[PDB]
Design a protein around this ligand. Structure first.
Ligand SMILES: [Mg+2]
Ligand SMILES: [Mg+2]
Lengths: 783, 136, 120, 68, 64
């Protein structure tokens, strides 16, 4: 092994901001690096556009102008000259810059304001693209990445990317096929689910079923490819067509790639454009809409290194090459899913029956508690209806969080009280067995189908366990799998913790008086860990969801099986003394022919069924191609278009009002703290402002200090439905609103949804508001 | 149909006739999570165990009370008006249809006491919305 | 009746099917969803006897049919009146086959008899 | 004229009192259940031994929507 | 504001002075694809290429 690409699976998220570095974001390369960063800007700002516009000036521009003020309303080659000088046509069509100065009559300011208005109309408040950087690392230690490739004079790297979207070609998503797959159990999925038929896998028909024969169905696949080298930083678009080739056709920008002089590849996703072939085809289903395409894609990343002395190193085998997938935006980048896609990779390598051998540190359990605690910013239940989060606030309030790190008998009841509230992914608790033919029926709170029966519900005898989120088995009222459980191996860690079978260092204890202090400490451990290649591999996936999978947000259930990886090995703790769930070397299974594979357009006929998955387990079998990914294979399962799946990934209401169940709130928030409220609690009573927290200076300062602080906390406590942060069909007199209009409107409104960003509260005083709050910015919710 | 009329701007939310057909109410479930003072000798205090409620600082205890007090619920969500369940449509028209049977299950607002608000900022008389869906 | 080609070549794969009225959980509570009745008539009396069940069972009366015997021993079986209904007027039967909260008066069942001659 | 036949249904002789009156296959039914039903000793063989309600239970509920 | 071009008609005149007027191509559209025209007569956000208006002429003879 000579050179390897990292990360092994890169992630880029769609956004309507431009594909340029100053106005884009990068996928995390170090976990937890920016959790409290109150300067983050995930939407394009006025200052960013003004800065871009300044830099586009002169250049000689100012006196190339100045010469024409004398020489005179302009003419076309007149301003054909003074565009082109600006270098802005890659951001806005050249047409619109033309007529923007047509309408004109210090002339270098009539020019600016007219241009800034064009840029602002296109990009102000736009969802920034989250691009993935890919790096070549040099190896030995035999296979270990030591250092990034450093190019010298005469050295060159050429990158190649081939991507596809097969959503419109693939099968309906009804539920996860692996729910009926015979297994001994993994770190991610208990054998009980299939063995006791807790959530049977359904058959699924083809999407776009009127397109018949494999040859004609190839038109439903969008694909593109491109190359860039360290010898030219011009960005290259990845542009396909739908339908592919009197057929009316749409260009689909699947992404853009560029490589800098140091050999780093930067991959941008598409613009978030989804469309039907006819305007009257509405996307009324959460996952399966015929006649639709979107610009999500995924595919194969390879490179060739050419050194000055002639030597050439091909990075193409599956051990060394990489993959890229594009995904919906992350609308709360600092809020981590409780179980991540990196956790699925880690759990896929474990056997359920071996979980007794797992060794546990407190840093293996802390992420669960920390992520759940931080769900308060995106989900009402975790703010006001979560007894574990309230107990953490209790502990923080007396600087007593460090008791959770005590493995001794005197702390056992404290640890057990928390552990016992968590749902067991054996799914064998809180059940009554029909026929001890044996059906396991939950005696906890069920999630009813919308198809109502006016017969009294059976009263629940067991408390609802944590977390309060739906799961893979949502289709089946009374199944224990209706609700989310942390996966077997993470529950094992929590179980070891409760039992006292865990280790922790004194250095950790000394930084553990509040949960935030310990989170900052662990963030510092990631930041100074020397394995940058593996941290980048993990950081790409730690912001992605790892359950439930119905189908999910970014990716779905094939990722939780070891069969999708060609390599999946534990390497090390994050730090010699601190596990923090570990660092791993993993690689996707890849078809090395990519877009040219004879399996690029495989399917299973009229339906896909778990029997096909069963047949695919044997790598010598006819069906093993299911796991050997060709471009488009990771994202084809997901909802088409992704926007209606996102609008369906929200609350699922029960007959009982609280807690409100939420699907995937860390990345598609459900209840958020709007900017309008932040502006009504951010200020102190002594603030030197004519308006303080939305009151006149005189009124704010006339009230008692106690009443002033109460009003702050009242405003802080007002959480807004995320679906109401743009017009999703509920706005206006007699507007219908409702679920289906949300699906339909999200195709246009995804780019206007609230984006959650850390913000400071400089002087909370005694109000109870933390010094860092997470605030949702949208145009509707801003005052 | 006598409820909120939403504008493109989120706030303030316009309401038709909220004094008699409320639009945002304070549920019984929240009342049961702020009505107690920290000195209560109950096994559960404001929805917390005795241990947790009394272990926290008095300032944090009062902050939790006011956070609960501040949680207002859409009155249309106090009974099943067509939005309950997996892929339930919800929306305006289902509300009109379901109210024919559900009017008798909607939340009813009643004055209730807070015996010892302490420094919490909660008034001694609060107006609490009782329904079967919002009681827990 | 059915060629082996249909299954052999997967011409029309059988689909999985979920439960109707899925919010009714446990076998014991799902027995309420079954409407049943029984009756007997004899050669000695041609009085018609209704076969009348309830939905949910143990609320609406469901006439599943009617039986008569004439003096020659012929059994005549009438079906119900064609009444179908939902437990709530607002529950509309928008699916061709699978509408929760609905019952109809269709039924089927077992027909037996005892012959009693004069010689015992 | 396509002939005359003597045929009889399989019947559960306990009728409404059969222990299999309320049998099902759990959260879903699938062809696997019918496959297992072929074996007369299976715990699925009851599918073919009709108790009251077993002939019409497959049909649309209510029949009027299916007719339209 | 994205603008749509609407061909309301086309005109031509032959050498004998006959004006020929062609209507549009029959293209109707909403400003957003999700705006469906569910009413027989009154659909907001929609336009069509129907039109009507004024036809005038000037005759110029060789003698001025
Ligand atoms: Mg997030
Ligand atoms: Mg009143």
């Amino acid at each position: 092994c000579q050179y390897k690409i990292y990360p092994p699976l890169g992630i880029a998220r769609v956004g309507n901001g431009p594909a340029i570095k100053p106005l884009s974001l990068s996928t995390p390369e170090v976990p937890w690096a920016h959790l409290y960063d109150t300067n983050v800007q995930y939407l394009v700002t006025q200052q960013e556009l003004e800065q871009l516009l300044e830099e586009a000036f002169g250049g000689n521009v100012i006196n190339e102008i100045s010469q024409i003020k004398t020489k005179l309303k302009f003419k076309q080659e007149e301003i054909e000259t003074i565009t082109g000088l600006l270098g802005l046509s890659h951001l806005v069509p050249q047409q619109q810059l033309s007529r923007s100065l047509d309408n004109l009559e210090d002339i270098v300011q009539q020019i600016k304001g007219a241009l800034l208005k064009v840029l602002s109309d296109h990009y102000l408040h736009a969802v920034k693209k989250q691009a993935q950087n890919f790096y070549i690392y040099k190896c030995d230690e035999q296979g270990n990445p030591v250092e990034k490739l450093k190019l010298t004079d005469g050295d060159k790297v050429t990158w190649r990317v081939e991507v596809a979207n097969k959503k419109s070609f693939w099968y309906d998503y009804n539920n996860a096929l692996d729910l009926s797959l015979h297994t001994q159990g993994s770190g991610n999925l208990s054998k009980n689910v299939s063995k006791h038929r807790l959530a049977p896998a359904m058959t699924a028909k083809r999407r776009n079923p009127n397109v018949i024969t494999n040859s004609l169905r190839k038109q439903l696949v969008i694909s593109s490819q491109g190359s860039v080298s360290s010898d030219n930083n011009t960005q290259v678009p990845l542009r396909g067509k739908f339908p592919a080739n009197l057929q009316e056709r749409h260009n689909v920008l699947q992404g853009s790639i560029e490589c800098d002089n140091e050999g780093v590849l930067r991959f941008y996703a598409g613009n978030g454009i989804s469309q039907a072939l006819s305007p009257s085809s509405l996307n009324t289903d959460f996952a399966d809409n015929s006649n639709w395409f979107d610009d999500i894609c995924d595919g194969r990343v390879t490179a060739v290194v050419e050194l000055k002395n002639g030597d050439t190193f091909e990075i193409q085998d599956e051990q060394s090459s990489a993959w890229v997938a594009t995904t919906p935006p992350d609308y709360a980048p600092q809020i981590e899913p409780i179980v991540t896609m990196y956790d699925m990779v880690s759990g896929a390598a474990l056997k359920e029956q071996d979980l007794d051998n797992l060794t546990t540190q407190f840093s293996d359990v802390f992420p669960i508690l920390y992520r759940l605690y931080r769900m308060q910013w995106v989900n009402q239940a975790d703010f006001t209806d979560n007894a574990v989060n309230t107990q953490i606030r209790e502990l923080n309030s007396e600087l007593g969080f460090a008791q959770l790190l005590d493995n001794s008998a005197s702390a056992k009841s404290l640890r057990e009280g928390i552990f016992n509230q968590f749902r067991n992914p054996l799914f064998d608790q809180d059940i009554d067995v029909d026929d001890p033919s044996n059906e396991w029926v939950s005696n906890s709170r069920i999630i009813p189908s919308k198809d109502e029966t006016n017969i009294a519900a059976k009263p629940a005898t067991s408390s609802l366990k944590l977390p309060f989120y739906p799961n893979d088995g949502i289709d089946y009222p009374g199944s224990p799998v209706q609700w989310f459980a942390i996966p077997p191996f993470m529950y094992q860690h929590l179980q070891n913790w409760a039992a006292g079978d865990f280790s922790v260092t004194q250095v950790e204890k000394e930084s553990a008086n509040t949960i935030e202090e310990l989170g900052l400490f662990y963030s510092e451990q990631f930041k100074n860990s020397p394995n940058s290649a593996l941290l980048c591999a993990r950081g790409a996936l730690d912001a992605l969801y790892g359950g439930g999978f119905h189908p999910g947000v970014e990716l779905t259930w094939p990722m939780r099986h070891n069969l999708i990886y060609s390599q999946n090995d534990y390497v090390s703790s994050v730090t010699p003394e601190i596990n923090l769930l570990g660092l791993r070397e993993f690689r996707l299974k890849q078809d090395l022919q990519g877009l040219n594979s004879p399996n690029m357009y495989q399917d299973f006929g009229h339906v896909i069924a778990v029997d096909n998955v069963t047949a695919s387990i044997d790598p010598n079998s006819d069906a093993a191609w299911l796991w050997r990914s060709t471009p488009g294979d990771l994202t084809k399962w997901m909802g088409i278009p992704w926007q209606s799946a996102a609008a369906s990934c929200q609350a699922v209401y029960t007959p009982e009002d609280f807690p409100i169940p939420s699907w995937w709130a860390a990345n598609l928030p459900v209840h958020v703290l709007p900017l309008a409220r932040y502006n009504k609690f951010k200020d102190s009573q002594s603030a030197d402002l004519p308006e303080i927290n939305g009151m006149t200076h005189s009124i704010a300062q006339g009230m008692s200090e106690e009443t002033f602080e109460h009003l702050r906390l009242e405003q802080f406590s007002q959480r807004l439905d995320w679906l109401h942060t743009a017009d999703l069909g509920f706005v206006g007199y007699h507007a219908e609103g409702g679920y289906t209009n949300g699906l339909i409107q999200m195709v246009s409104q995804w780019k206007n949804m609230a984006m959650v960003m850390a913000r400071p509260v400089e002087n909370p005083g005694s109000s109870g508001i933390p010094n860092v709050v997470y605030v949702a910015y949208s145009q509707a919710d801003k005052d």
